[PDB]
């Protein structure tokens, strides 16, 4: 299951719930109302903070911004957790962003339940 | 003891509940509140009925 | 308030007599109202 | 149906009283989906081992929810018409006590304004 | 040690029930200290309802270039951080305003704007039915 | 509980502030009675005083549920539109059901 | 009158009636125009307008005395904004109503100036600028001059 599948079942998510006339209360990221972390995924290689921050404050501003890079050689691994400073946010941008292509790479978004810092 | 007989027998006898229904029937009338407002054989959805009713 | 076929001359023609009935039945304890005089009643078959 | 199915072994194992006393509380829920999720397995639970192990307080809450969750259908499915029809026909004799609740609520809802609950 | 982790870690609880939730919780239970001292009906001549009235600003009106004036006047003696400046952004179902790093384009997936025709047109289809139903009758 | 009143200032000032044995007539149907019936009425005005009765600050709390909310002055409660006194009125059986949990502990999602 | 959508001289000419009949009216609507006025900034814009559009028909059917504009001090301060839209439409109004000479002609005739005295206000600069500027931008630009005449031949 390569990550592209990761981001048409998210969507899926979205318009599935959609078609069942799900109220705005018990919507699938009502579970995830303590949380204002999302991680994005399939970034490309060469994006650094500046831009994922100028991509991603469309909705809010941004309070934390976490980049996983490789030890070894300081390069992005591909991956971003991402602490928006209202909850509200985090869900407009897993609806809005999770699966924009940037640069080729479709990126995906999708909230975060007990993030643990590093 | 007639009384309580007689409050009774007019919220349960089924024939009177045949009439009702054969009434409502032919005026083609519907409820559109599910769940029977809590009416139960508590007193007050009697109790407002054109007998006037005193709290103290 | 309550929100083919082959049909006969008279089935597509002539009232409908539902709604008739059904107006005459809601208002019915004022249009047949006691006392409103001629001074004669009429008792129904059973 | 994945998690239906493997919820439906868990209670094979571990009896059903834990499970259903687990689940009982969301056919009271939101989300009609998810409703219709716990009344699957409770109904497929309850058909296989039957209702030996229901105490009293959890009968209890079980008709409860099952008759709120028959008054909440927005939807067109045999899911808790199944779901009612397999707990009673399972409770077999016990439910002597609730028929006049079952009994008025079926007639009240018979006279509503909407063929889909009349039906 | 335990201290230094738990700095760190505190911190990091708040940012994961990111602040704006937080001081907006703060500022309703002060609103509700503030009623909870007053009584139950709320009259018309209330000094507080009466002074909000008279500063609600409406349409149309040359007062509102000098009142306007007066407060772009002040508030720009303020220590606050810098808010997004540009052409419009998007609507969005909560009202949030972007952060003052957004670089102006707009990236989405079309999923807000797609929302918003659903619920016009749940209303359009309203009307329809209630028409349909009546006519009938 | 009709005694919880003694907490809305008209009926408590006007009775403290009495000089002389008196009898007055109020409305607590301010004008619901336009368009619900005597049952919708009273049942409203049981969940008012329950409330009223049960916590009383929350409970104002509800009952001025926004800032441009008003009462008329011959009016004992509050001027909302229907949709708002459904809400509000789902509101205060919460309220109550919370606090019948917090002092019988129960839990109040298994009733 | 004023909880309508849309104004039709009914309610007005009415009221007329009554008052052409009695004094006690006409009394009543010196009393109503003073509190109307002062406390107007309740009102959404539609009953705002339909009020000012009330008043201007009492007043060039002239059942109300035109010395009731006495209440209008128009500083800047002494003014919130809801009143001032208040005398936007008003005014508006009564000049589309008499026209702008017979306007002009009934707000220049002397024995109203005490009345007129803060809609034409020359004691201080201040408001009497504030004054004409307003009255310019609604587009009364004749009364506007004339004080402005006044006001700078003055200093």
Redesign the interface.
Known sequence: MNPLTKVKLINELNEREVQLGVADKVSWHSEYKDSAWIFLGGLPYELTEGDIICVFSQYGEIVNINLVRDKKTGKSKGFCFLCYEDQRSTILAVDNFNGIKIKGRTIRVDHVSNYRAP | LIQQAMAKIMKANPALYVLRERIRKGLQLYSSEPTEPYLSSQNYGELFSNQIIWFV | WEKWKKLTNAQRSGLNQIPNRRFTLWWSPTINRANVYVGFQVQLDL | RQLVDTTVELANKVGAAEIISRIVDDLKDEAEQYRKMVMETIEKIMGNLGAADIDHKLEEQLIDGILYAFQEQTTEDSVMLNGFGTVVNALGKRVKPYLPQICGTVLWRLNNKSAKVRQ | KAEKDSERDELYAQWGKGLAQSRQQQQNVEDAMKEMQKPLARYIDDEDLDRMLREQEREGDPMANFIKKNKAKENKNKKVRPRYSGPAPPPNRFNIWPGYRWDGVDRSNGFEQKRFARLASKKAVEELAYKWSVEDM | P?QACL????FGDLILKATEPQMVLFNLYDDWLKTIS??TA??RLILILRA?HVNN??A??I??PD?????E?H????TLTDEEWIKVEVQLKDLILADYGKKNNVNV??L | CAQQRTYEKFFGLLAGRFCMLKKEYMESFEGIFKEQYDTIHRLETNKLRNVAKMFAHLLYTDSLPWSVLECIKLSEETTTSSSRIFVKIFFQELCEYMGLPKLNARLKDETLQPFFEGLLPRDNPRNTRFAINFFTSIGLGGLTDELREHLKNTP
């Open positions: 009709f907490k809305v200032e008209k005597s049952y009273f049942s009223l600050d929350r104002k709390v009952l001025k800032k441009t909310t008003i009462t002055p009016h004992i409660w509050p999602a298994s």
